[PDB]
């Protein structure tokens, strides 16, 4: 953490460097998807296969 810095501390023995910021944070996708915030606001699944 002296080399590449912390997320809030800059790099102590480089000149101007900080860690690259994430593009999404909560990476565990299933704990987003089976969460009551989303699972509330969804339509009902239509999984009845209607063959020819």
């Amino acid at each position: 953490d002296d080399l590449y810095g912390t997320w809030r501390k800059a790099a102590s023995l480089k000149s101007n460097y900080n860690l690259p910021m994430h593009k999404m944070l909560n990476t565990d996708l299933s704990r987003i998807l089976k969460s009551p915030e989303i699972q509330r606001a969804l339509r009902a699944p239509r999984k009845k296969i209607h063959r020819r």
């Binding site: 944070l25 990476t27 969460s35 915030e37």
Partner: protein, 187 residues
């Protein structure tokens, strides 16, 4: 046979992002689900903008964000850019903003957080509002790129304000026959 002409038979638009990034493909794996399984078209247009190329999702700057968020009516709403929210140095005070972007530059993150704002990513945006309600979707200036000054009606044609490709701007470099009214003709 059939006399249908197959020229425009195939749509050209994207179905997956060209990037081999894995965080962007996780955001796509989330918003595919949200646009397939909700009925709000914010999700469709936000996955359509996650798919795009980085010359089609241009960097929205914080001056545009402050203006288009201080337009009346949309107080305490969530600004959403799919591109890169960049700092704009020619603005002094910054109001409390609630923004969401793929990637915000470091000085803009510092500026918003000293103003007392809050930065979100798209996974946190989907947790905070799944149908995307309470959001103002903004995009950067797409024809702001310098390339579009070379496009359109070609130079050397009447009423065409197009920057011509020249190797160095100066006195001698294509100022003479098409441009003057003495030297030849003025278009």
């Amino acid at each position: 046979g059939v006399d249908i002409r197959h020229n425009k038979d195939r749509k050209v638009r994207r179905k997956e992002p060209k990037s081999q990034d894995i965080y962007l493909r996780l955001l796509v794996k989330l918003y595919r689900f949200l646009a397939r399984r909700t009925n709000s078209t914010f999700n469709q247009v936000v996955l359509k903008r996650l798919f795009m190329s980085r010359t089609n999702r241009p960097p929205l700057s914080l001056s545009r964000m402050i203006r288009k968020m201080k337009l009346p009516g949309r107080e305490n709403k969530t600004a959403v850019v799919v591109g890169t929210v960049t700092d704009d140095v020619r603005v002094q005070e910054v109001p409390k903003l609630k923004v969401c972007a793929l990637r915000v530059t470091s000085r803009a993150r510092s500026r918003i957080l000293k103003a007392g704002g809050k930065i979100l990513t798209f996974d946190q945006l989907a947790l905070d509002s799944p149908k995307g309600r309470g959001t103002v979707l903004l995009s950067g200036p797409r024809k702001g790129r310098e390339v579009y000054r070379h496009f359109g009606k070609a130079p050397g044609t009447p009423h065409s304000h197009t920057k011509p490709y020249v190797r160095s701007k100066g006195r001698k470099f294509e100022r003479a026959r098409g441009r003057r009214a003495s030297r030849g003709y003025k278009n």
